Amino acid sequence: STGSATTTPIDSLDDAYITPVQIGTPAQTLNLDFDTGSSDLWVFSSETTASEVDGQTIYTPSKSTTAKLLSGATWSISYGDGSSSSGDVYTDTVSVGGLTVTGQAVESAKKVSSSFTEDSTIDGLLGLAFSTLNTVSPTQQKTFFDNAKASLDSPVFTADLGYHAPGTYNFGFIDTTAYTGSITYTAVSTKQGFWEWTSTGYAVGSGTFKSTSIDGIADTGTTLLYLPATVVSAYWAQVSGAKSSSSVGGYVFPCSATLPSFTFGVGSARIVIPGDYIDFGPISTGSSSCFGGIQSSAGIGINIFGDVALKAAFVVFNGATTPTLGFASK
Ligand code: NA
Secondary structure (H helix, E strand, O other), X not given: OOEEEXXXXXXXXXXXXXXXXXXXXXXXXXXXXXXXXXXXXXXXXXXXXXXXXXXXXXXXXXXXXXXXXXXXXXXXXXXXXXXXXXXEEEEEEEEEOOEEEEEEEEEEEEEEOHHHHHOOOOOEEEXXXXXXXXXXXXXXXXXXXXXXXXXXXXXXEEEEOXXXXXXXXXXXOOOOOOOOOOOEEEEOEOOOOOOXXXXXXXXXXXXXXXXXXXXXXXXXXXXXXXEOHHHHHHHHOOOOOOEEEOOOOEEEEEOOOOOOOEXXXXXXXXXXXXXXXXXXXXXXXXXXXXXXXXXXXXOOOOEEEOHHHHOOOEEEEEOOOOOEEEEEOO
């Protein structure tokens, strides 16, 4: 089997991407944030505290003939941005892009934090990291990918995120039309439950490539590229008037600037992030200070190849017995 679904930016900045997902019988379609940095499929629901719902589409398990309470199971998750959610668990049929899993754990939110409530466009998350991070207790549950894997034509999914445009998540196949050149594969450590890999280095603009190992995770659920402070300082030093602002919470730059590209290494291959991808717009409405898309990972305890980096590539998440990542230009 295979599946193919379009993923759509939630706003003009590509702050996140939503992908429609069918849950239940008859189908209830919710727009979920596919997150390769977490392992819970959770949704706004008929159980969510009413004051914490503001415009999201909810899953109502009592209207699904295939929903069953997973008795005694609870979940609770905290993300890197400080947001959180928790609740109880149903099993139900879940389809993505024509690919169906029966008996998927659908984590129904009873509580969500303010950042979820305030984002009307995201109806929940679909985690695609390793199932060892799933938060369901007392019986840990599998991700949608892990439950689909054995049925897929190939045990892979691919992320093809757009810059200010829709893109695609495919399950079970490589679309050889979706990228240029060849795919370079690189080793993954699953020890922290992430798609953790080691970049071979970087370049700023037209500058020389610096060969240096940068361990980090491929995380579709993180907007920005978070890298060591040395690397980030070297990038923003090429932008006149850029500075790190403790008041704003990262590097800012004059909105009048033209940003340089940023290149990262994948083995001997190179992925180029155009400068435009690094512009996250005014810090507040009407400001001439703009927020940067490359930020320091110092204090986060891991480097994160988020959407800024991943949307410059066609990315293969290879879930074979020994997982690997692949990157191609596109
Ligand atoms: Na922000």
